[PDB]
């Protein structure tokens, strides 16, 4: 049932979503997605602990709900998804093509999972899974080349030959620690591709084999750095191995604010609990590896 002991009663303790308007419109799922953003973090904790991502909806919502971590966009785009449709929003599970800077080219295999949203016939994108500074605010109508200001950037969603694209536009980065300036984790593009994808629905049986490669290539950036995001009122923090991160969106002059911080391993354990509201049951390897991941 949706009353008291139910699974969508504990969903929405979880995001800390006390609303009630009692209303399936764009308002609410707004609300819905920047409740998920602010407490279900996107990160890979599991694959660096020596455990799996698993993603059947059971699994996930014991480990993101009950056990209050986050997850992968296979493991949190999956929860919203069931979240909205149990509240009666006609959502559909969409797969995407994630763009790689140094390769100029978006990745051959869908592994990424977003989904659409239809209210009064108007259709809206929606990720609660991508993280860092590319993650949306607001839902994006699905409007070819209209331009889309948000607090972390402004988005555009483009129609070309039966694929859409995401892009953002980005503010000036300010890095007031100059040891940091060429981090790894920072690049210097104004205009970002984001993802590309198709409209064809999805169930998550078609992400089953990216599941799997996702977790055990060497190729693969979830294998190569160990991460968590999560996204505040004013704008993003991020751990990626042993660099703490924290931007603040619109700073001042039209630029952001990142601050970097090393961490020692004793102190890991304290800012996984202390910003991001993650504990773990297993030991953390941190991993800096060199697969391209930026904040
Ligand atoms: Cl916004």
């Known amino acids: 049932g949706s009353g008291s002991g139910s699974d969508i009663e504990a969903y ?19 609300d819905i997605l920047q409740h998920q953003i602010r407490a279900v973090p996107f990160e890979n904790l599991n694959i660096h602990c020596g455990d799996a991502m698993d993603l059947g909806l059971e699994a996930i919502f014991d480990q993101v709900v009950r056990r209050n971590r986050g997850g992968w966009x296979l493991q949190v785009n999956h929860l919203l998804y069931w979240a909205l449709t149990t509240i009666g929003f006609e959502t559909t599970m969409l797969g995407g093509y994630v763009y790689s800077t140094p390769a100029k080219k978006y990745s051959t295999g869908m592994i990424h999972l977003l989904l659409q949203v239809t209210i009064d016939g108007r259709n809206y994108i929606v990720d609660a899974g991508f993280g860092r500074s ?5 839902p994006l109508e699905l409007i070819s080349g209209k331009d889309q200001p948000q607090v972390p950037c402004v988005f555009r969603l483009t129609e070309e030959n039966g694929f859409w694209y995401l892009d953002q536009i980005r503010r000036e980065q300010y890095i007031p620690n100059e040891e940091f300036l060429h981090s790894d984790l920072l690049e210097d593009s104004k205009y970002r591709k984001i993802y590309s994808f198709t409209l064809k629905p999805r169930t998550i049986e078609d992400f089953e084999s990216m599941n799997t490669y996702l977790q055990t290539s060497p ?5 190569s750095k160990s991460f968590c995001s999560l996204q505040t009122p004013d704008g993003v923090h991020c751990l990626v191995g042993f660099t703490l991160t924290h931007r603040r969106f619109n700073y001042k002059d039209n630029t952001d604010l990142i601050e970097f911080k090393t961490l020692s391993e004793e102190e890991i354990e304290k800012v996984l609990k202390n910003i991001f509201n993650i504990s773990l049951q297993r030991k953390l390897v941190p991993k800096h590896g060199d697969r391209f991941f930026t904040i």
């Open 12 to 30: 929405f303790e979880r995001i800390g979503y006390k609303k009630s308007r009692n209303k399936l419109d764009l308002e609410t799922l707004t």
């Open 219 to 223: 190729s693969s950036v979830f294998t």
């Open 134 to 138: 590319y993650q949306m605010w607001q």
